[PDB]
Amino acid sequence: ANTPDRLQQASLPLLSNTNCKKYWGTKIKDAMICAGASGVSSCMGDSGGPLVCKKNGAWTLVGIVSWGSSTCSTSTPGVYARVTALVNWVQQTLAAN
Amino acid sequence: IVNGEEAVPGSWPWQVSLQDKTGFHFCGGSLINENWVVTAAHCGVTTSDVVVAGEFDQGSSSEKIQKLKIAKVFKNSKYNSLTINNDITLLKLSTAASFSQTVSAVCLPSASDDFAAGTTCVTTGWGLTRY
Amino acid sequence: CGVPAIQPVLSGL
Amino acid sequence: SSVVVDTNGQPVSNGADAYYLVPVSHGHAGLALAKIGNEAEPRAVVLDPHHRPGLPVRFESPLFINIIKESYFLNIKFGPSSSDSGVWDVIQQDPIGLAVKVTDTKSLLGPFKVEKEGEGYKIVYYPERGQTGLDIGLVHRNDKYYLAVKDGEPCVFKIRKAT
């Protein structure tokens, strides 16, 4: 198992939750988004980091690295926390603190 | 990240390393402003952990990094440790980040935003490159 | 937010 | 939700490194596979007093984190990362009871947690994840200590990185 000194990046496609269920079944909830199975994978030590997509010229946090393949299989999608489902909670937390 | 590539140094300026007090990296996070980091609930961050901002090479002793203390941890109460659903925690910094070329914030979406299936996005981190 | 001062460069664009 | 640490005070890795489970009592006994009754293969997990340090294990979580915390549901397995022949589960088996055995099948969320106890850690089994856990203890038979559900009588281990 090889731990990089230097920050890594990978481009990867989003999946629909219905298509993600082919891989992970009923584990996939509304507050998750899958990405990958495209020849790249998030792996141990990436947890908590970002999945970003361009909106209107700016990088936007779409996912938070969460869970997936115990082997970081590049033919299985990673599972990320879906930020759209959680951002009302983020904004109320900031506004109250 | 397996089968990724090295980033351009400083090109993901919201990417932080969550380190315990002895220096080991255990999780990533994203700055959303000078005072707040978004990370995963399962990371179990405590106020004794350190937010490291502005890092590219974790083996370098010469980068301009910021070691930021944590005032309070706000784990989403709906986080479910059996299903891993609602996997989000906010860290409120006791020492604000100083934004720079290499340190700055990611945008948050609107709750209504549509990120369509098939869209090419990007993930970053210092996770294993081989299992 | 979301516009790095140092623009990321990704293979294949 | 504390970080699980090895005998060097270093965090235990998620799958990448293998560890000896070193019992704080039962002197220098070590993990081995043994037969219950007379099956073809030895598949029961035991502490054998004739084995030091014993077969090392790996701890596996589907979370993309590089360390194990006490709150994580784990698979526990013998052998290298590449093999799945050595995955722990709890199987009804006379005369042991609910015996720890290796199985040829693995679930996403394993049934075990590693919890602080005395000077080290115990293995706790969660047959239903949202319900109470059951301590893993020892049933003495045939010169071996069979790992088994023995709620309230946990086997206490220190965790020593294999290097």
Automatic annotation (TrEMBL), chain D:
GO terms for molecular function: endopeptidase inhibitor activity. The keyword NADP does not apply. Keywords: Signal. This is Kunitz-type inihibitor. It comes from Bauhinia bauhinioides (Perlebia bauhinoides). The lineage of its organism: Eukaryota, Viridiplantae, Streptophyta, Embryophyta, Tracheophyta. The chain holds residues 19 to 181 of 193 of the full protein.
